[PDB]
Amino acid sequence: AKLSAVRIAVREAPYRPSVVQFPPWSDGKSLIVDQNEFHFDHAFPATISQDEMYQALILPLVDKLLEGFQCTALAYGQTGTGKSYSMGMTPPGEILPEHLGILPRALGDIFERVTARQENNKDAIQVYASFIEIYNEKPFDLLGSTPHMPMVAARCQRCTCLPLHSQADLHHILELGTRNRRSRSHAIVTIHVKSKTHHSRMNIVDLAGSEGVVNINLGLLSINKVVMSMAAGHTVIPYRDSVLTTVLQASLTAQSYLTFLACISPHQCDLSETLSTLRFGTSAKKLRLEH
Ligand SMILES: Nc1ncnc2c1ncn2[C@@H]1O[C@H](COP(=O)(O)OP(=O)(O)O)[C@@H](O)[C@H]1O
Ligand SMILES: [Mn+2]
């Protein structure tokens, strides 16, 4: 069995001549860069607001998460392309309403839907949040008592989950987790939706720079492998090829959802970096086949 859906989106960062061109005639899921043509499920130009991007890219997942399916939204790309901004990895309180990312918007749609069905349901739903960090291929629980001690054979599930009852709680753990953060640092804030009989996760991954100057994008590449392995039942999925695919092992299963947000720079000087990001995207779309 394979994933329910693997979606790929691209978002252009604010300009400061853009190498990113959105054809005057297109399905709106295409873009051209350096004479090459890329086709994805979404192509957000720099003028698209947080709200629009969330409504189109994540909102749909809230329903799957609620029906019990594991969901992952992963942002990757060159440093400074709006990844952390996009996933809303900064404390909500200090951020203006229009600039709030996916994290706080998703938590709100979750609460609203849980409260709108707390009377008519199969059984009460509990909501928690975990904050993990991968530093130099080593998982760190930023919400635990030892936010500086690697994990092993127990990082997937074992990871302090703090209760969530309001945006205030999300702010707290986002503030806490941040203060516990010390050449690549990826963040994974998982919104856990637990019930007596079901546990579904919404993994919001905010990877570190993909630029250069096992490599640096072992996580990313490892995901593609893992994906292609499920579409053909290789009997042995390479979940351990990287900490990233290990920590997200319970979410990289059949019927689970995965979405990539490729953030790119519109600047000429980042041409090579922007192309790498786009190329990987294409591969992810290719492996995304058969699903
Ligand atoms: N779409 C956007 N709208 C307004 N400001 C943005 C946008 N995207 C990025 N920024 C700003 O650019 C800077 C870098 O964004 P950031 O997400 O931290 O890059 P990254 O996390 O990928 O290294 C931050 O000040 C962020 O607010
Ligand atoms: Mn960042």
Swiss-Prot record:
It is found in: Cytoplasm, Cytoskeleton. Residues 5-287 form the Kinesin motor domain. In adult female, found in meiotically active ovaries. ATP binds at residues 77-84. Changing residue 84 to N: In allele NOD(DTW). Required for the distributive chromosome segregation of non-exchange chromosomes during meiosis. May be a microtubule motor required to hold distributively 'paired' chromosomes at the metaphase plate until anaphase. Belongs to the TRAFAC class myosin-kinesin ATPase superfamily. Kinesin family. The nod(DTW) mutation is a cold-sensitive recessive lethal mutation. This is Kinesin-like protein Nod. It comes from Drosophila melanogaster. The lineage of its organism: Eukaryota, Metazoa, Ecdysozoa, Arthropoda, Hexapoda. The gene is nod. The chain holds residues 4 to 322 of 666 of the full protein.
